[PDB]
Design an enzyme around this catalytic site. Structure first.
Site, PDB file in Angstrom:
ATOM      1  CB  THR A 133      -0.889   0.098   1.281  1.00 21.91           C
ATOM      2  OG1 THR A 133      -0.182   0.184   2.475  1.00 21.91           O
ATOM      3  CG2 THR A 133      -1.842  -1.044   1.283  1.00 21.91           C
ATOM      4  CB  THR A 134       0.346   4.698  -1.461  1.00 19.73           C
ATOM      5  OG1 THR A 134      -0.311   4.029  -2.638  1.00 19.73           O
ATOM      6  CG2 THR A 134       1.053   5.971  -1.750  1.00 19.73           C
TER       7      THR A 134
END
Ligand SMILES: [Cl-]
Ligand SMILES: [Mg+2]
Lengths: 243, 240, 195, 111, 235, 241, 244, 231, 250
Positions: free
Chosen positions: A30-31
């Protein structure tokens, strides 16, 4: 060939393919982002809501080291936790011997040397995380990003994960439009926006926003989580910008 | 330390290193054990491709573990020395703590346990050796004959053989040995042992060793002429 | 433990060892044999600290018996005594040393000669015509200086030994409950039952 | 030189009936001629209908009780919640005490 | 080659699964649990007629209230039995009581997975652990080299296991007497054994609260074999 | 072919892992240069900051090992920092044990011996770096000593390292043929830095701004790096001549 | 991990052989021939140097024949460096025995222990075996003059006459032909040289390509002397037997 | 394929196959369900047997008076991890006189499982765990996976056909969360949830296994005739 | 973590070859030529100084090294392997000899200790053999002058004269013609320079050639006076000037 089957083996190029393979695991995650500001730093992360059954606000991913350093990472979450546990041991022994809390550049090298050590032997695996971290020390604010190879640099802004290119582009605009500097409260709002914009690269599952910050003025140099009214204010700012 | 698991399971449920250690035993010179009514006899083959040997100083095939127990073997000669040494030490250690010499069953059980330990220890290969352990328990006149093998299993035998062409001599013993009536005397037991080796050996000259063990630490090795008399007697009766 | 004597004569070595085992104000036993056979032609008597004595004797015994089985050969008395000395020489610089004094009487079958070795707990070895440990020596050495001759028979050696025991029974403060006598010669080790 | 032991005083008392048992102890805690506490309990319910007291040097007494309570807890885990009988508890305590034979718990224990 | 503690794509440990194949090659062992006791029986399987069958020790005492039967690479069981015996006696020393059958089994099964790169490979032997305690009464456990153990009313292990287990499925009920269980082990052993069943190539044992763990004599088993043959011919 | 994966000999007597570690040296695509003055030793290196989000002050391949010794690295930063931390520890320990500051050449030897161990021992990989050590030694004067992944080391009159190393090397060779001496005959270190930059410009054929270079200078009793403004002042001096 | 690169030196073949031991013996079969011959009044040790160069210092050289103590010597065949490791161990073991028992070590005990060390390298530790075969020549008061051999397997045997290294097959046939039990030392010297002279891969056997040694009771009354032959002494003994 | 020999090796797409194969052992395991309200937390576990003659493999293990888990996969690995949890819960009590937080319990399990996935020689744990507990911040439910990933949830399920129960709980979320001060009704919801993962077989008296912890309820397990109420 | 390579990386192949030793010898063959000649009153060892770059100072790199005051060493093959061997060789001369006997070891015994180290790299766990051949020249009171060669296997041989490395085959042939047992030291230095010119290609002078001797004692190089028995080191490295003087009368 077979040069990619074992860690710490140079290919004929001069590359360690196992480390490059660990980077792929980071790109899959995920970012997460980091924004340096006037008198501190701001960290933010994308938390994918896999199910309605996930308890909101109760799967915290951003971690604190000592009382003045914040760490966030993308990729293999357990590997990130292992690195932070080491960071806490490194920071504790520094403070034990030298009294003062560990400076951020000093702390950055402690993680760097430890991660780099995991590229020296075939009996260990490289770390499957890129770690964004930083805080406030005697010399001011510092933001760092550390990669599976052990490579790290200082940053004005940093991003990693599946939506890194979207986040990097958005970060580059902030550096250009604010040469004199960005404020701490502004950076929190911008961090929210950039996570929401970077969520376009992971838009099947909806997500939960999580922000933290260190600031000499706003948090008194200590690491704190952004919660309640200040969090909702940042979410609303981000919601207004996407539309 | 060298840690590698050398002895491991294969898809079909076999430990190949243990099974290949049995092949080394099959290559080794033949050894036979026959127990009578009041004695046990250990017979051993010696290959005759080696002339110009010095039989005075050459390691004998049958080894004394204590004054009342003996150990012969088939397989790797160098490996056998390690088992014999360990067994001899345990024999003295047992006398020291229990104030009584080992039983033949106990000594076998120890040797078998050592062989087993080398089949699931890291960094080591199994012993390429099977042993025949024979003797008499302290203050006992019942003859004892046991066998061990690389895997670590052990068991008692009325008569048994190991080594090369052992399946031929086992065939001989299976029909010639009567459970209801074992060899009543020493002469009968030695003759049956020599007969069984003569199925396999070649010549009955300096190829057969015989060692007789009797109760109360009475062990003696037969000389060439003594063994040659049995060979001469058997061949004359055979021509019939 | 207390009295152990040794006399080497023409064709044998004679070891005499006291039978008393005392603790406190009680003689716990009066028939104790303070010796072990190390090999068929080698005998070791011992005396010293309680527990240590037997533990040490049996430890040496086990090692010599192990050697005999391994090589199918009996070690010479000289060789056994040197092995024992080295063990005591190690012991003295250990955390807890063996406080044991020994006499090693043996018959060397290759030389056809009797041999008597006296070794104290420090590892101090000497070959002697006659030896003793503890307070016994303060009487027996001078007595044997006078009465001993090198060419004596075993029977003459036993009478010479009776002379020592009589003197000890007369002048020693403690009751040591007589001695067990053993003879080491070409035919091996045997015990004199009536002394 | 540092003396690792102390005497916290007090006294305890156990009596057994036909279908019951009592374990009593005073609540005073002292050092030398001073009172530390007028109410400091030293008789504890350890579970499985076992009561225990370790009187003498309170630090050692509290350590022992703490260890036995913990021993009862792990007896349940390792043996399917089986009730620890009083005779089994006693034997377990012997091994706790004798484990420190050469640096003792300075306490007289009653259960 | 490959690691000793490696997982297969299906989610199983290669070495553990291969050790299970070794156990299938082993001689048959059967256990049946009743309210009057637990019976244990084994196939001796002598490799040659010259081998003295009474020296084949495939049923074993752990304590007075716990017995054990084995199947597979039986040499591997020696250290497992040694551990079990020490565990049983040590518990009695620490707690002045008999040790629970389940707790003993669990202690043995803790050795099972202590292998890797500790010992070099898993055990190549399965155990039937039978016993009695005051809490859970008469019990039978099947201890594998996977570190897993199941309690059973009845269980067969070894070469004739799947055929014998199907037979035990039909024959077992909760009101079996000890005598009925003894015959049932002999019956099922005779069915799956290669050679013809007699007192010399098969061995019986049992554990009762009153008399503890007892291995039967060849004279006693022979009468039960003769009693079994007569009862099958009687209908 | 497992003789190419670990540090053992190939049939032709070669260590392929060592040779591949040499190729890792140029992975950063940076060229370094070192020259000696009368009183000083100057080292210069290219500085490339591609990402706009990077903090350019933290991007550096020059290291202050001790007060007197400086070190520039050609190779990846993780291995560079690994070598730097070790050199710093070794230099500090030397001073404590032997009562005087570790010489440049002795540190170079020590690091080279460590690099040699990795070529002989299997479990340790070589570091993919070339270490150039510089100082003004109190006995030997201005000093340049360079270490590589093979464990080789030697002193230099001047040297260069990187992808376009050979062009820089010959450029310097031709100057010392002409000058007929072992060093830059110059009084102040400022002009020795100007020489170093000038000859790098000629060899590489590129022009440099203040942020395209990174400079380290060794004088008697201290080694120090130049700031952006110190370099800019230096670039102005070259331009006005 | 490192499993990938492990040769597994201490395993069995499917046929029940030890790969590394068999290959070590193959190595030894290319080494210079060494012969031991035991007579009634002494022992001879002869050994051929591996293809000599004319500029090799011959007099101050030791390749084949080594002294373990005053009563025992060894002839080497294989890797010299490996042999020297084992020789220093053997020399120490002999002095340990003398220190313990105040008696010179019996030949077989020394041989057994050295052979037990070699055995260890074939069963455990994961290291390559020693590529060395020894001929032990020695004397003690139990068995008198004794010849033994040990090889990388750790197996040892006793001999009246024996060869190791190159051309042992041919050498053993020639020894088996001319050897007899009532033989003297001077006769055994002649046999040892004649055997090497025929089995040699060289054109002609010369003094500079040989090491020679005897263990006689040729000292004064009931005591053993070791004679490691000098270059000039080998030259003379080679002329005396009529080879050159 | 070539990158699944050991846990120390990454694949070219950045995967750890040995960790994934360990994850596969959980899917083969028998179903178990976890759910909680604000007052109580419940574990429901379908036990599995070898055959009709065998016993049913016990799925639920107690860690402390206020905490415990259910297992799915390799049972010996669950024993190792549960024993570690017992020690950590116990360390917290003896040293700090403090009941171990359920969140810290998860963090400790994550870090223990992680070390096995980065070192040569070892292997990943082959079991998934559902940890329930009641601490100073109310009721909790955790899901442990041997990759190291631990997740706090209102409800969940792991094992074979766990997707059926997980969907049901996702629908029932709003109902069962507000079952406060009522143990039997929260169990009923859990028993109905696990029933969505059943095929051919149904819940019998010696098949079902239930556990509960709450405000005024220590961690207790129900088996045998005690679960007959909920069938 | 930890060194998991506890097994041998050098093993016997089916043909009986030890591969890694053979390959190490191949690495020595590629190396620059070095030689040694023994005279009646001394020993000479010499080699070419192959410069990696003309900017490099070849004086700082010493191919010929002092081990003890009366023993010197030169090599052919891998320089780094040689450097660590010299370090270990110097230390072992002290730890295993001088600290025990109060005097420096004789040539043959120091050689023996170096050989032992190189043999262990051939058999120990997780290591490759040393990729060098050494030539060790030295003097001691009871053996006089001596010259030894040491190979990657750990084998060592004494030589009257020899050469190793690149052009060793031709150099050995040259030395066979010129060597006699009556050579004085100066004559041996002359022959060494002649032999080395054949293998060297580029410049041939005192700056590209490294040469040292084991000869008479040098009181001037001792550093102190007052002890009559201490007369100075027999090892002397010839200067760049001293070589060029002998190259004129060549
Ligand atoms: Cl160093
Ligand atoms: Mg004395």
């Amino acid at each position: 060939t077979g040069y990619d089957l074992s860690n710490s083996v140079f290919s004929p190029d001069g590359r360690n393919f196992q480390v490059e393979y660990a980077v792929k695991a980071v790109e899959n995650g995920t970012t997460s982002i980091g924004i340096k500001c006037n008198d501190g730093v701001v960290f933010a992360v994308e938390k994918l809501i896999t199910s309605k059954l996930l308890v909101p606000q109760k799967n915290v991913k951003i971690q604190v080291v000592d009382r003045h350093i914040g760490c966030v990472y993308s990729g293999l979450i357990p590997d990130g936790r292992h690195l932070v546990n080491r960071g806490r041991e490194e920071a504790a022994s520094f403070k034990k011997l030298y009294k003062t809390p560990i400076p951020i550049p000093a702390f950055a090298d402690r993680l760097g040397q430890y991660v780099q050590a995991h590229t020296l032997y075939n009996s260990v695996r490289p770390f499957g995380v890129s770690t964004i971290f930083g805080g406030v020390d005697k010399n001011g604010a510092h933001l760092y990003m550390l990669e599976p190879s052990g490579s790290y640099w200082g940053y004005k802004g940093a991003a990693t994960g599946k939506g890194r290119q979207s986040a990097k582009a958005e970060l580059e605009k902030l550096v250009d439009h604010h040469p004199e500097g960005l404020s701490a409260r502004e950076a929190v709002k911008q961090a929210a926006k950039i996570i929401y914009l970077a969520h376009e690269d992971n838009k099947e599952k909806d997500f939960e926003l999580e922000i933290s910050w260190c600031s000499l003025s706003e948090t008194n140099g200590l690491h704190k989580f952004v919660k309640g009214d200040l969090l909702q204010e940042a979410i609303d700012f981000a919601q207004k910008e996407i539309n | 330390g060298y840690d590698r698991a050398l002895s491991i399971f294969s898809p079909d449920g076999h430990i190949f290193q243990v099974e290949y250690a049995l092949e080394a035993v099959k290559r080794g010179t033949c050894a036979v054990g026959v127990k009578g009514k009041n004695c046990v006899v250990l017979g051993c083959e010696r290959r005759s491709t080696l002339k110009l040997q010095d039989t005075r100083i050459t390691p004998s095939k049958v080894s004394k573990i204590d004054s009342h127990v003996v150990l012969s073997f088939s397989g790797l000669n160098a490996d056998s020395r390690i088992l014999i040494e360990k067994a001899r030490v345990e024999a003295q250690s047992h006398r020291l703590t229990l104030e009584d010499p080992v039983t033949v069953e106990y000594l076998t059980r120890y040797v078998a346990g050592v062989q087993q330990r080398y089949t699931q220890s890291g960094g080591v290969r199994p012993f390429g050796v099977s042993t025949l352990i024979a003797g008499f328990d302290p203050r006992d006149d019942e003859p004892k004959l046991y066998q061990t093998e690389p895997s670590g299993i052990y068991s008692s035998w009325s008569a048994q053989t190991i080594g090369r062409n052992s399946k031929t001599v086992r065939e001989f013993l299976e029909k010639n040995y009567d459970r209801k009536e074992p060899p009543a005397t020493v002469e009968e037991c030695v003759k049956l042992t020599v007969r069984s080796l003569l199925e396999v050996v070649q010549t009955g000259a300096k190829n057969i060793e015989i060692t007789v063990v009797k109760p109360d630490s009475d062990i003696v090795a037969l000389s060439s002429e003594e063994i040659n008399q049995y060979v001469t007697q058997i061949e004359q009766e055979k021509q019939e | 433990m207390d009295i152990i004597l040794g006399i080497r004569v023409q064709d044998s070595v004679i070891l005499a060892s006291s039978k008393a085992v005392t603790r406190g104000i009680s003689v716990l036993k009066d028939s104790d044999d303070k010796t072990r056979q190390l090999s068929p032609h080698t005998l070791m008597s011992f005396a010293g600290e309680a527990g240590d004595t037997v533990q040490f004797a049996e430890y040496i015994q086990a090692n010599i018996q192990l050697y005999s089985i391994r090589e199918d050969y009996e070690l010479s008395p000289q060789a056994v005594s040197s092995f024992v000395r080295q063990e005591l020489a190690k012991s003295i610089r250990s955390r807890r040393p063996y406080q044991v004094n020994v006499l090693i009487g043996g018959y060397d079958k290759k030389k056809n000669k009797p041999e008597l070795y006296q070794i104290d707990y420090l590892g101090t070895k000497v070959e002697l015509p006659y030896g003793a440990h503890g307070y016994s020596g303060f009487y027996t050495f001078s007595l044997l200086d006078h009465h001993y001759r090198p060419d004596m028979t075993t029977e003459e050696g036993l009478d010479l030994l009776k002379l020592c025991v009589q003197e000890l029974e007369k002048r020693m403060p403690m009751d040591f409950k007589g001695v067990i006598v053993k003879i080491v010669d070409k035919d091996g080790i045997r015990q004199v039952d009536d002394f | 030189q540092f003396n690792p032991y102390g005497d916290n005083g007090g006294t305890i008392l156990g009596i057994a009936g036909e279908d019951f048992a009592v374990l009593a102890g005073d609540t005073r805690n002292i050092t030398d001629y001073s009172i530390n506490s007028r109410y400091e309990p030293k008789v504890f319910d350890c579970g499985d209908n076992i009561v225990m007291s370790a009187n003498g040097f309170a630090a050692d007494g509290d350590a022992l009780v703490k260890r036995f309570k913990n021993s009862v807890k792990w007896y349940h885990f390792d043996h399917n919640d089986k009730k620890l009988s009083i005779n089994s508890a006693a034997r377990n305590i012997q091994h706790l005490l004798y484990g420190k034979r050469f640096f003792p718990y300075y306490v007289h224990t009653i259960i | 080659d490959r690691g000793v503690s490696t997982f297969s794509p299906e989610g199983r440990l290669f070495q553990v699964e291969y050790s299970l194949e070794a156990i299938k090659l082993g001689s048959t062992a059967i256990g049946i649990a009743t309210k009057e006791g637990v019976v244990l029986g084994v196939e001796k399987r002598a490799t040659s007629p010259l081998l003295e069958s009474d020296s084949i020790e495939k049923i074993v005492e752990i304590d007075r209230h716990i017995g054990c039967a084995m199947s597979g690479l039986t040499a591997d069981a020696r250290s497992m039995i040694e551990h079990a015996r020490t565990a049983a006696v040590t518990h009695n020393l620490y707690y002045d009581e008999d040790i629970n059958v389940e707790s003993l089994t669990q202690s043995v099964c803790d050795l099972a997975l202590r292998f890797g790169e500790l010992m070099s490979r898993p055990f190549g032997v399965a155990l039937l652990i039978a016993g009695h305690d005051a809490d859970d009464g008469y019990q039978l456990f099947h201890a594998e080299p996977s570190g897993t153990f199941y309690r059973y009313n009845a269980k067969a292990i070894g070469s004739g296991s799947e055929g014998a287990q199907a037979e035990l499925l039909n024959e077992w009920h909760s009101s079996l007497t000890l005598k009925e269980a003894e015959l049932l082990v002999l019956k099922i052993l005779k069915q799956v054994m290669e050679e013809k069943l007699d007192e010399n190539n098969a061995q019986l044992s049992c554990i009762t609260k009153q008399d503890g763990f007892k291995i039967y004599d060849n004279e006693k088993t022979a009468e039960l074999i003769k009693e079994l043959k007569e009862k099958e011919a009687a209908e | 072919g497992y003789d190419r994966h670990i540090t053992i000999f190939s049939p032709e007597g070669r260590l392929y892992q060592v040779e591949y570690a040499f190729k890792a040296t140029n992975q950063t695509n940076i060229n370094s240069l070192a020259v000696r003055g009368k009183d000083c030793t100057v080292v210069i290196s290219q500085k490339k900051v591609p990402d706009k989000l990077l903090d350019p002050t933290t991007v550096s391949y020059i290291f202050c090992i001790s007060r007197t010794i400086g070190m520039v690295v050609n190779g990846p930063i993780p291995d560079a920092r690994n070598a730097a931390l070790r050199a710093k520890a070794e230099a500090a320990e030397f001073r404590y044990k032997y009562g005087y500051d570790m010489p440049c050449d002795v540190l170079a030897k020590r690091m080279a011996n460590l690099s040699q161990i990795y070529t002989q021992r299997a479990y340790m990989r070589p570091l993919g770096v070339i270490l150039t050590f510089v100082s003004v030694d109190e006995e030997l004067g201005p000093s340049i000593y360079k270490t590589d992944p093979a464990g080789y080391y030697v002193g230099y009159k001047a040297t260069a390292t990187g992808p376009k190393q050979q062009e820089i090397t010959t450029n310097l060779e031709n100057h010392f043929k002409k000058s007929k001496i072992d060093h830059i005959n110059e009084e102040s270190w400022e002009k020795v830095v100007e020489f170093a930059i000038t000859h790098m410009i000629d060899a590489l054929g590129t022009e440099f701004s203040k942020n395209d270079l990174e400079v380290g200078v060794a004088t008697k009793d201290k080694f120090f790096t130049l700031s952006a403004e110190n370099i800019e002042e230096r670039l102005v001096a070259i331009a006005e001549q | 991990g490192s499993r990938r690169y492990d040769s597994r030196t201490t395993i069995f073949s499917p046929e029940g052989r030890l790969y590394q031991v068999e290959y070590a013996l193959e190595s030894i079969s290319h080494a210079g021939t060494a012969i031991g011959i035991m007579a009634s009044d002494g022992i001879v040790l002869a050994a051929e140097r591996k293809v000599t160069s004319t500029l090799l210092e011959q007099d101050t050289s030791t390749e084949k024949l080594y002294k373990l103590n005053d009563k025992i010597a060894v002839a080497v065949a294989g890797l010299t460096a490996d042999a020297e490791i084992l020789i220093n161990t053997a020399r120490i073991h002999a002095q340990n025995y003398l220190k313990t028992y105040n008696e010179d070590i019996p030949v077989e005990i020394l041989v057994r222990r050295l052979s037990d060390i070699k055995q260890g390298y074939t069963q455990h530790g994961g290291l390559r075996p020693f590529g060395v075969s020894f001929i032990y020549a020695g004397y003690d008061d139990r068995y008198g003059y004794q010849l033994y051999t040990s090889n990388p397997s750790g197996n040892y045997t006793g001999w009246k006459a024996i060869s190791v290294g190159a051309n042992t097959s041919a050498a053993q046939t020639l020894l088996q032909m001319d050897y007899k039990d009532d033989m003297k030392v001077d006769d055994a010297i002649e046999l040892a040289l004649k055997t090497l002279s025929k089995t040699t891969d060289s054109s002609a056997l010369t003094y500079d390509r040989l090491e020679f040694a005897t263990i006689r009771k040729g000292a004064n009354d009931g005591e053993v002397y070791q004679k490691i032959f000098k270059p000039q002494e080998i030259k003379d003994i080679l002329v005396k037997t009529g080879i050159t | 394929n070539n990158y699944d020999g050991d846990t120390v090796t990454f694949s070219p797409t950045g995967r750890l196959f040995q960790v994934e194969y360990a994850l596969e052992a959980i899917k083969q395991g028998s179903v178990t369900v976890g759910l909680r309200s604000n007052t109580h937390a419940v574990l429901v576990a379908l036990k599995r047997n070898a055959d009709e003659l065998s016993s049913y493999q016990k799925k639920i293990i107690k860690c402390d008076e206020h905490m415990g888990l259910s297992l799915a996969g390799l049972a010996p690995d669950a024993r190792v991890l549960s024993n570690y949890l017992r020690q950590q819960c116990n360390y917290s009590s003896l040293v700090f006189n403090r009941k171990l937080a359920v969140e810290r319990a998860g963090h400790l399990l994550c870090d223990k499982a992680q070390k096995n996935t980065q070192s040569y020689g070892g292997r990943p744990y082959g079991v998934g765990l559902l940890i329930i507990g009641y601490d100073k911040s109310g009721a909790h439910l955790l899901e442990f996976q041997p990759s190291g990933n631990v997740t706090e949830l209102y409800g969940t399920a792991i094992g074979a056909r766990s997707q059926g129960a997980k969907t049901y709980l996702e629908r029932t979320l709003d109902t069962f969360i507000k079952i406060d001060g009522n143990p039997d009704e929260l169990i009923k919801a859990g028993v109905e949830a696990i029933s969505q993962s059943l095929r051919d077989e149904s819940l019998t008296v010696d098949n079902l296994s239930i556990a509960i912890v709450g405000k005024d309820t220590p961690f207790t397990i129900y088996d045998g005739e005690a679960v007959a109420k909920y069938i | 973590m930890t060194d998991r390579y506890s097994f041998s990386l050098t093993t016997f192949s089916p043909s009986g070859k030890l591969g890694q030793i053979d390959y190490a010898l191949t690495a020595v063959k590629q190396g620059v030529t070095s030689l040694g000649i023994k005279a009646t009153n001394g020993v000479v060892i010499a080699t070419e100084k192959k410069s990696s770059s003309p900017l490099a100072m070849s004086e700082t790199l010493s191919k010929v090294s002092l081990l003890t005051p009366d023993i010197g060493a030169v090599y052919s093959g891998m320089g780094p392997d040689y450097r660590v061997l010299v370090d270990k060789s110097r230390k072992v001369a002290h730890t295993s000899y001088k600290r025990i006997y109060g005097e420096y070891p004789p040539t043959k015994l120091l050689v023996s200790e170096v050989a032992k180290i190189m043999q262990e790299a051939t058999q120990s766990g997780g290591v490759r053999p040393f990729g060098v051949s050494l030539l060790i020249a030295g003097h001691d009171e009871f053996n006089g002058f001596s010259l030894y060669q040491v190979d990657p296997s750990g084998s060592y041989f004494p030589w009257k004269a020899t050469a190793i490395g690149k052009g060793s085959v031709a150099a050995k042939t040259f030395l066979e013609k010129r060597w006699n047992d009556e050579l004085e030291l100066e004559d041996a230095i002359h022959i060494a320079l002649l032999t080395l010119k054949e293998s060297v290609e580029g410049e041939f002078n005192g700056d590209t050639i490294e040469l040292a001797i084991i000869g008479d004692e040098n009181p001037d190089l001792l550093g102190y006076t007052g002890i009559p028995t201490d007369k100075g080191p027999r090892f002397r490295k010839l200067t760049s000037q001293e070589i060029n003087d002998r190259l004129e009368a060549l």
